[PDB]
Amino acid sequence: LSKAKISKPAPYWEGTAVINGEFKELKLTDYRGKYLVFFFYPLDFTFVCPTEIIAFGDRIEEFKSINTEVVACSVDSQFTHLAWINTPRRQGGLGPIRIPLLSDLNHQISKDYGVYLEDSGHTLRGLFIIDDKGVLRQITLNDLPVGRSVDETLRLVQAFQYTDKHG
Amino acid sequence: LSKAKISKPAPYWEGTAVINGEFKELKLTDYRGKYLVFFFYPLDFTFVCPTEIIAFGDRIEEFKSINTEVVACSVDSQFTHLAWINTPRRQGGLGPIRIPLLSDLNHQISKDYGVYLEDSGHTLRGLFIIDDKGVLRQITLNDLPVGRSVDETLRLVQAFQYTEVCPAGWKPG
Amino acid sequence: LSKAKISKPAPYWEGTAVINGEFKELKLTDYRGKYLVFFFYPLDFTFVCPTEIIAFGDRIEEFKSINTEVVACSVDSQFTHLAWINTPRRQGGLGPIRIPLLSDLNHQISKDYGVYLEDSGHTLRGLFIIDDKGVLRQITLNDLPVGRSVDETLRLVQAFQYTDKHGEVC
Amino acid sequence: HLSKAKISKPAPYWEGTAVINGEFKELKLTDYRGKYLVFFFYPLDFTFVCPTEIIAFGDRIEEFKSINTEVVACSVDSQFTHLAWINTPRRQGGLGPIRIPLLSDLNHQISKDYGVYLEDSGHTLRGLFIIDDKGVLRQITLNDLPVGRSVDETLRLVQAFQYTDKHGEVC
Amino acid sequence: LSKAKISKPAPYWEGTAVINGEFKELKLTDYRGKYLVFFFYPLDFTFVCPTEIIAFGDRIEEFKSINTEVVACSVDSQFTHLAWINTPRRQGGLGPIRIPLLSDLNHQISKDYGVYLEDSGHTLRGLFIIDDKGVLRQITLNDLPVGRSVDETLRLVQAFQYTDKHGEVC
Amino acid sequence: LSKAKISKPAPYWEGTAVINGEFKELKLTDYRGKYLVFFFYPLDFTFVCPTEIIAFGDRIEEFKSINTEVVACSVDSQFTHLAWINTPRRQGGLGPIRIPLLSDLNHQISKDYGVYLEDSGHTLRGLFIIDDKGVLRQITLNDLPVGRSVDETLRLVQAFQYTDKHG
Amino acid sequence: LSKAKISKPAPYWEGTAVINGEFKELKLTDYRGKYLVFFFYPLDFTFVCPTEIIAFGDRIEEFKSINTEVVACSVDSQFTHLAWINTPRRQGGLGPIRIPLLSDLNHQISKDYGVYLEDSGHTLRGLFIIDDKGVLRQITLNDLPVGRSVDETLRLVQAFQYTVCPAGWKPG
Amino acid sequence: LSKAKISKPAPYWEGTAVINGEFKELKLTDYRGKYLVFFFYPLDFTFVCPTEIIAFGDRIEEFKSINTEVVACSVDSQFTHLAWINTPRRQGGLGPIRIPLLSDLNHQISKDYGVYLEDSGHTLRGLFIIDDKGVLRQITLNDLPVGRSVDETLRLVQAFQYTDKHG
Amino acid sequence: LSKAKISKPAPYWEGTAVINGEFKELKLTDYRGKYLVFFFYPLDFTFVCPTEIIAFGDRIEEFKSINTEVVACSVDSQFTHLAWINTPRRQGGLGPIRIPLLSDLNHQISKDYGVYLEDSGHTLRGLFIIDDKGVLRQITLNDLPVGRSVDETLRLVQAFQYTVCPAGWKPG
Amino acid sequence: LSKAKISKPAPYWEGTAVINGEFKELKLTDYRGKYLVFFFYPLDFTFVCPTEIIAFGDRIEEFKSINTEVVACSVDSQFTHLAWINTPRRQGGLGPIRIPLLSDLNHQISKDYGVYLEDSGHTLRGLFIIDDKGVLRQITLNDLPVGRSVDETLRLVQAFQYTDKH
């Protein structure tokens, strides 16, 4: 069922994302000419602190300077994404964030990337690296407990870029 | 794909609901011996005031007095269901509410009741009435914009339990 | 087997109706440009008073004034529809009525709207609301005992027309 | 889905609600075992065509009853429309009172089993079947919607069947 | 399997018939413009007196005066048909007869008219009435023992001729 | 559709035949223990002289004396088979005959034997030789014009009976 | 699987035959305008006297005088067909003969005519008569032991080309 | 279609072979306990000198002495095989020979060995060496013209025999 | 065709590995009761410095100390694995190493893990972390150029075994 | 599954070979116009003396002289072929050799030729002779232990060249 294959073109996706507090139509092709770090996380409004999403949002600049963008995705509706941002931390929210939050409500993107859990109705923790020519170069799939490293994602992006010229 | 047929047993469902600020496992079979008004609404945290859901929460006591329970369902996570209730009504939330909010995250229940929109990724505005022996007795499917009446739902339950009036002079043969 | 989907075009139909005491060929498209309340009822000439059919005939003036029409339908022949109308209320009849009675004798329309009961040989209690652009906007299906509200139908039609201009309001 | 009605095979089973002397009674084909049954379809109640053929059987039913024979009529109309028809006076468009049952085949099962249902019109041909005391179909008569039916020819036919059941092979 | 449907054109057939002792190629289309009584009987050279064939042969003139033609049919070879006619009535034959005897040897026509018995290898007693435009108007199927009324057959054509112009009127 | 295979059992058949002026139920198994010449001919009451059938009827004793029986078959009814026999030769008949005339009116036997003509509604000229064990040993099929040999049939039966004992 | 049906065209065949000590391509259509007796026999070099094959080779002039040729066939190679021919009859051979010996080594021809015995690896005793327009007119299939009569074959052919009733008999 | 796989048991075959002028039923299992050189050749009575087949017939004793038998096979009938053997080498024949000529008339053995040529109706030049345990050990397929070495075959068999003990 | 699903039991494998210079049958079930890092690398005897394999071999003790084992796999024969190890680092070889090198010569294992490249005939660079109960917990797949972090692998294993919030953050 | 048929064109193959110490892309069509001896052997770095592979490498000049080429093939990577050759004949290696070593890493060629073993993951000992027109002429399949004769291959090639004329 998964369309995501390494060194084949990354599966096309499109949907509504929340960017800087507004709804915007986002597509994989918007990021052509740049590397894109594309990752799924299970759910909004959970009891687990969203450290990993904040960590990417805070340090986004390290990505921007190496021609990389970052996009987060969950199966939550784009309306739920917003409420999370607009919900105070004492009550569980995310607060403002500097990466787009993409909604995969009809589950289609999750399924194409092969990270959807048929029975849970939400995603794995999956992260995909797609290059500037629009090709999937790396796949990371974690069981539900384990978080994700900003440093390690960076190491990977740089290594792909370095070998893009000299190998 | 739809399993809901009138006067056949209502399709079984079970899932996580938010009841009185807590997560509780809820299944259709829990409502045996009582009538159940089971209705879907599209999404939480929208910009449309959730009056229909609220109206049921406010007047929930009138259903209780005629042996009827009410459960609402959307395709949202129970975690989102919780946040909505915990978001003040003044700030766009649902606020506290006295009916359970059932989560159909894997979409399995929506599809069973035939209210899921494959391309939109959420439900219609759909309402089902089920009797105490667990049989589907009424189906209401609305296009997304139009809301839903408590009075009319009440009228229907009473009408299924009890059994507009005849013009004077009309007689049968 | 049912073809009726919300916000897809309402399924086409045509058949012979009794309108103001005459047989007339009626088709769904005749109601283009107006909202149509199209509803089924089980049978003519039963022993239960047709309160729901009469109530629509009496209050028809309220539907026409918001550019809405009403058509009732059963699996009975157009000839049985006529006899019913031409039979006095004191005699079990409907008496004269101001909405058309459409005959779905060969059961094709009932099947298309998904309200036909295979074993009983008649319809459910079903009501569909269709807009001026010919799109299905509402489906209501009741088990045999429970009747149908004119007020609630008027409310739905009004709500659909209203949101057709200002999309969603409190 | 096609006709089940075959000559000299057991007659297709049917059961449904009929109007008999103004009342609803559950009726089945097996109820007529031990007697010959004349079972026929007519298109619709409440038409502008005179129900002369249905009436003629009702008037002359006794000639059939005396030769160990029953007669039953059927249309695709509801038992309620059937009743309404009988209780409408004979000249002001009704059938008037009748002494044979009017079987309602509202769900069309019997009409399709007998191969007399018209898919597009939603009613029957004019068909008459003669069935014996062992429940075996012996005769099929199908008329285009316009032509009516002879009680007499039916009467003779019932008689010819009765004769050949005992002394059959010779003129 | 039967192609004979009431008020649709009668199933086409063609074959060799015996007419006045001669072999003749005969088709349904020869009877365009006239009413045709077309009927099957089980077998030739049987022990049952062939009265119905004779009775029709005798009164053929009444048919001709009301614009009706008649054709009899069995699954026997045309050759068997001939021997029968040429066999004296005293010897079990038909003797000469004034209606054509059409041969349906390859069983194709009995099957089209839905009158063939798979196991017997011959027909039921079946009669079909066809109008001047070639449309099937009546079907009569008798179990093998019972003979047939000329009179009733005569009546039916008249009822059809009568209702083709005025239609049934009270 | 033909069931007739050489040196496999000849296909079973059964039906009503006219044997010595009476109707009799005849079946292929009645000839167990004897060789059987089973042949088809097109029709009774034709304008062609029935020489081949009469030739078999006349010389039947030569067959009985080599433990062989003979049966003729056409698609005509047994009532027609009787009438033919009972029709004087002068008036076109067969006259009395000492071989059975099998009626295959429902065409079932012809179809089993591969001699039925779909379009004509009668048979080919076919002859099958079946042994004492009910096994088909020889198949002969002629186009409509050509008749059939008693001498040659006889030669064939003898050759089969001879080689049944001494190779 | 058999393609041979009466009064339909005889199934096409072509292959290498031994004709006058030589290999020649022979196909059914070479015999158009003539009747052909095309018959199969099981095997070359047996201990059974090839009386039936020889009889056809010998009396061949009688066929030729009624516009008919004869071709015999077995599943043996044309080489074996040849060797059979170059062995004297007294010494078990066929000796030289005046009908072609068609070789069906790959069994393709046999199968088309429905005479191949799947398990034995050779043919039945089968004989087919084909008319001058190339249409199959007669089929004779014998179990393995029993041979075939030239007289009878001849009789059949004349009758097909040609186209005696009990006394007192007349038709009606 | 070929059933013959290296180091799997050689495909079973059985049939009539010609041995010392006699017909004898022969099967592969008869050669258990001995190595068998089983080879196919196209046709009897061909115009090609049977040098390769005779060489095996002449030198058979070298095979018998290293516990090996040799059997040749063609699709020719056992009756054709005998005639070949009873035709003198001087007459285009094979003359008497001391290895069996196996007949694969119904082609079943050829097909099993994957050496039947569908359109020619005969075999390739194919050779199989099967060890004493009934296991296929060696496969050789030659174009139609080319003859075959006894010397070379013996070398291969011995090597198979040698490695049956050492390595 | 891939069998590797997260939080389902890891796909079974068995084959011959080279461990401390010897051939051994190694199977996934041998690592029951321990976490296993199971990773593929494309090929032996390449011109690319085999740093990632060596780095794991050098720091293997850190894994051993958190009850974790490491096994490397390539589609190379076990014989090639041995020659690699017995070829000096000075000569381009791997030299001795302290993790087993599993040979997947018939490609069967690679296909099960969905790491085989059909046209190239070897694997991408893929790593799987499997728990002590034998369940696949993590999948990492890299295009051929990019190596893999031991530190990062370590972080991951501890994380699975162990189981920092924005300030002000509290749950409902 | 095997596509290799006698007196039909040899199945096309192409891949990377090690030729006289270098990586080179090689295809069957390169041997158009000359005879080619194409043979498989199981694995590099085995414990079996590569006497059969070496014998062809040593006497290569006799094949070159009858317009014939020889190419050996195994399922090992080309990197492994090289490493093998660069391992001295004394240390268990093949040492330098004068026939190309073709790598069939993705198993595609072995399978086309019908010598791959699904369960073992390597080839049989199989050798094929293909003529100057690219037609498959001879097939040899040995169980894994047993070597192959240079002489008999030579005898066969010559016999084929001979019948190419007469």
Could B119 and A106 be called an inter-chain contact, meaning their C-beta atoms sit closer than 8 Å? yes
E74–F contact, CB cutoff 8 A: no
Region for residue I168 given its phi and psi (left: phi exceeds 0; alpha: psi -120 to 50; beta: otherwise): left
By annotation, the residues of G acting in catalysis are 49
Which residues pair with residue J71 across a beta bridge? J38
Q: Which chain G residues touch F144 with a CB distance below 8 Å? A: 7
**CA end-to-end span of chain F:** 33
Q: Which chain G residues touch E86 with a CB distance below 8 Å? A: 172
Of F49, F141, F156, the CB nearest to G139: F141
Could C51 and B139 be called an inter-chain contact, meaning their C-beta atoms sit closer than 8 Å? no
Neighbours of chain C (3+ CB pairs under 8 A): B, D
A75: burial class by Cβ within 10 Å (0-12, 13-18, 19+)? buried
H82–G contact, CB cutoff 8 A: yes
Sign of the torsion formed by the C-alpha atoms of I21, I27, I28 and I30: negative
Say which DSSP state B6 is in.
T
Residue of H49, H66, H141, H144 marked catalytic: H49
Are F103 and F74 a contacting pair, CB within 8 Å? yes
Would strands D36-41 and D23-28 be described as parallel, antiparallel, or unpaired?
unpaired
Are I94 and I80 a contacting pair, CB within 8 Å? no
Say which DSSP state A71 is in.
E
C96–B contact, CB cutoff 8 A: no
Which residues pair with residue I111 across a beta bridge? none
Sorted by sequence, the CB contacts under 8 Å of residue H86 that are 6+ apart come out as: H21, H93, H96
Residue indicated by tokens 């179909």? D137
For G121, the closest chain H residue by CA position comes to H106
Residues in chain F: 167
Q: Name which of G73, G126, G70 is nearest G102 in CA terms.
A: G73
* H or E element at residue B51: helix B51-58
Please tell me the distance in Å from B75's CA to the nearest CA on chain C: 19
CB-facing half-sphere around the CA of G104: CA atoms within 13 A: 26
Structure-derived torsion over alpha carbons of residues D143, D148, D152, D158, reported in degrees to the nearest 10: 40
Residue A18: phi, psi to the nearest 5?
-100, 115
Residues in chain G: 172
Helix/strand/coil (H/E/C) assignment for every residue in chain E? CCCCCCCCECCCCEEEEEECCEEEEEEHHHHCCCEEEEEECCCCCCCCCCHHHHHHHHCHHHHHCCCEEEEEEECCCHHHHHHHHCCCHHHCCCCCCCCCEEECCCCHHHHHCCCECCCCCCECEEEEEECCCCEEEEEEEECCCCCCCHHHHHHHHHHHHHHHHCCCCC
G touches D, CB cut-off 8 Å, minimum 3 pairs: no
Q: Name which of D90, D4, D16 is nearest D46 in CA terms.
A: D90
D:117-146 residues touching chain B, CB 8 A cutoff? none
Neighbours of chain B (3+ CB pairs under 8 A): A, C, D, I
Please tell me the distance in Å from G158's CA to the nearest CA on chain H: 37
Q: Which residue type occupies H142?
A: N
Q: Which residue type occupies J33?
A: G
Please tell me the distance in Å from F118's CA to the nearest CA on chain E: 7
Residue indicated by tokens 């906007």? C137
Residue F85: phi, psi to the nearest 5?
-55, -40
Report in angstroms the alpha-carbon separations of D30 from D13, D18, D35, D130: 7, 14, 10, 14
B touches H, CB cut-off 8 Å, minimum 3 pairs: no
Q: Which of A141, A150, A161 to mutate to test the interface with I (most CBs of I within 10 A)?
A: A141
Could B106 and A119 be called an inter-chain contact, meaning their C-beta atoms sit closer than 8 Å? yes
Are A51 and B83 a contacting pair, CB within 8 Å? no
Q: Which chain J residues touch I75 with a CB distance below 8 Å? A: 105
I5 vs A41: CA distance, rounded Å: 17
Could A92 and B83 be called an inter-chain contact, meaning their C-beta atoms sit closer than 8 Å? yes
Are H130 and H35 a contacting pair, CB within 8 Å? yes
Structure-derived torsion over alpha carbons of residues B154, B159, B165, B170, reported in degrees to the nearest 10: 170
Please tell me the distance in Å from I140's CA to the nearest CA on chain J: 23
Which residues pair with residue E84 across a beta bridge? none
E101 vs E94: CA distance, rounded Å: 11
Residue I153: phi, psi to the nearest 5?
-65, -45
Q: Which chain C residues touch B55 with a CB distance below 8 Å? A: none
Residue indicated by tokens 């010779």? D170
Sign of the torsion formed by the C-alpha atoms of A68, A72, A78 and A82: negative
Q: How was this structure determined?
A: X-ray
Residue B126: phi, psi to the nearest 5?
-125, 140
* H or E element at residue B125: strand B125-130
* H or E element at residue C36: strand C35-40
Kindly provide the resolution of this structure in angstroms, with one decimal.
Answer: 3.3
Neighbours of chain I (3+ CB pairs under 8 A): A, B, J
Q: Which residue type occupies A17?
A: A
Q: What is the set of domains in chain H, with CATH numbers? A: 1-167 (3.40.30.10)
B147 vs B140: CA distance, rounded Å: 11
For D91, the closest chain E residue by CA position comes to E170
Say which DSSP state B118 is in.
T
Would strands J35-40 and B22-27 be described as parallel, antiparallel, or unpaired?
unpaired
Could J45 and I107 be called an inter-chain contact, meaning their C-beta atoms sit closer than 8 Å? no
10 Å Cβ neighbour count for C136? 22
Report in angstroms the alpha-carbon separations of H154 from H28, H35, H129, H162, J129: 20, 11, 10, 12, 21
C117 vs G133: CA distance, rounded Å: 66
Structure-derived torsion over alpha carbons of residues G40, G45, G50, G53, reported in degrees to the nearest 10: 40
Helix/strand/coil (H/E/C) assignment for every residue in chain D? CCCCCCCCCECCCCEEEEEECCEEEEEEHHHHCCCEEEEEECCCCCCCCCCHHHHHHHHCHHHHHCCCEEEEEEECCCHHHHHHHHCCCCCCCCCCCCCCCEEECCCCHHHHHHCCECCCCCCECEEEEEECCCCEEEEEEEECCCCCCCHHHHHHHHHHHHHHHHHCCCC
Which residues pair with residue H140 across a beta bridge? H127, J140
Greatest Cα pair distance in chain H: 48
Please tell me the distance in Å from D83's CA to the nearest CA on chain B: 9
10 Å Cβ neighbour count for J74? 25
A149 vs A127: CA distance, rounded Å: 11
H touches C, CB cut-off 8 Å, minimum 3 pairs: no
Could D46 and C79 be called an inter-chain contact, meaning their C-beta atoms sit closer than 8 Å? yes
Helix/strand/coil (H/E/C) assignment for every residue in chain G? CCCCCCCCECCCCEEEEEECCEEEEEEHHHHCCCEEEEEECCCCCCCCCCHHHHHHHHCHHHHHCCCEEEEEEECCCHHHHHHHHCCCHHHCCCCCCCCCEEECCCCHHHHHCCCEECCCCEECEEEEEECCCCEEEEEEEECCCCCCCHHHHHHHHHHHHHCCCCCCCCCC
10 Å Cβ neighbour count for G57? 19
I:4-23 residues touching chain A, CB 8 A cutoff? 6-7
Name the CA radius of gyration of chain A, rounded. 15
E63 vs E72: CA distance, rounded Å: 14
Q: Which chain E residues touch F84 with a CB distance below 8 Å? A: 83
10 Å Cβ neighbour count for B137? 24
Report in angstroms the alpha-carbon separations of B166 from C88, C94, F67: 14, 11, 95
Sorted by sequence, the CB contacts under 8 Å of residue A20 that are 6+ apart come out as: A96, A98
E55 vs E48: CA distance, rounded Å: 14
G3: burial class by Cβ within 10 Å (0-12, 13-18, 19+)? middle
Greatest Cα pair distance in chain J: 48
Sorted by sequence, the CB contacts under 8 Å of residue D152 that are 6+ apart come out as: none
B66–C contact, CB cutoff 8 A: no
Q: Which chain D residues touch E48 with a CB distance below 8 Å? A: 169-171
Region for residue D141 given its phi and psi (left: phi exceeds 0; alpha: psi -120 to 50; beta: otherwise): beta
F65–G contact, CB cutoff 8 A: no
Q: Which chain A residues touch I155 with a CB distance below 8 Å? A: 149, 152
B172 vs C6: CA distance, rounded Å: 37
Of B76, B83, B118, the CB nearest to A87: B83
Quote helix, strand, coil % in chain A, to nearest 5. Answer: 30, 30, 45
Report in angstroms the alpha-carbon separations of E48 from E43, E123, E146: 10, 15, 11
Could E156 and D171 be called an inter-chain contact, meaning their C-beta atoms sit closer than 8 Å? no
Q: Which of C14, C23, C45, C116 to mutate to test the interface with D (most CBs of D within 10 A)?
A: C45
Helix residue ranges, H only, chain H: 51-58, 60-64, 78-86, 108-113, 150-165
Are E148 and E142 a contacting pair, CB within 8 Å? yes
Q: Which of G146, G155, G158, G162 to mutate to test the interface with F (most CBs of F within 10 A)?
A: G146
Could H6 and J124 be called an inter-chain contact, meaning their C-beta atoms sit closer than 8 Å? yes
Q: Which chain F residues touch G6 with a CB distance below 8 Å? A: 124, 141-143
Helix residue ranges, H only, chain C: 51-58, 60-64, 78-85, 108-113, 150-165
Please tell me the distance in Å from D41's CA to the nearest CA on chain B: 26
G156: burial class by Cβ within 10 Å (0-12, 13-18, 19+)? buried
Of J44, J46, J79, the CB nearest to I43: J79
G160 vs G162: CA distance, rounded Å: 6
Sorted by sequence, the CB contacts under 8 Å of residue F164 that are 6+ apart come out as: F131
Report in angstroms the alpha-carbon separations of C148 from C4, C6, H1, J129: 20, 20, 73, 89
Neighbours of chain A (3+ CB pairs under 8 A): B, I
Residue of J6, J49, J66, J159 marked catalytic: J49
Of J140, J155, J160, the CB nearest to H140: J140
E27 vs E12: CA distance, rounded Å: 8
Please tell me the distance in Å from D37's CA to the nearest CA on chain E: 15
Are I102 and I26 a contacting pair, CB within 8 Å? yes
J touches H, CB cut-off 8 Å, minimum 3 pairs: yes
Q: Which of A49, A73, A74, A77 to mutate to test the interface with B (most CBs of B within 10 A)?
A: A77
Name the CA radius of gyration of chain J, rounded. 15
Helix residue ranges, H only, chain I: 51-58, 60-64, 78-85, 108-113, 150-162
Of J105, J118, J122, the CB nearest to I122: J105
Report in angstroms the alpha-carbon separations of D101 from A55, B136, C43, D24, D67: 85, 37, 20, 10, 18
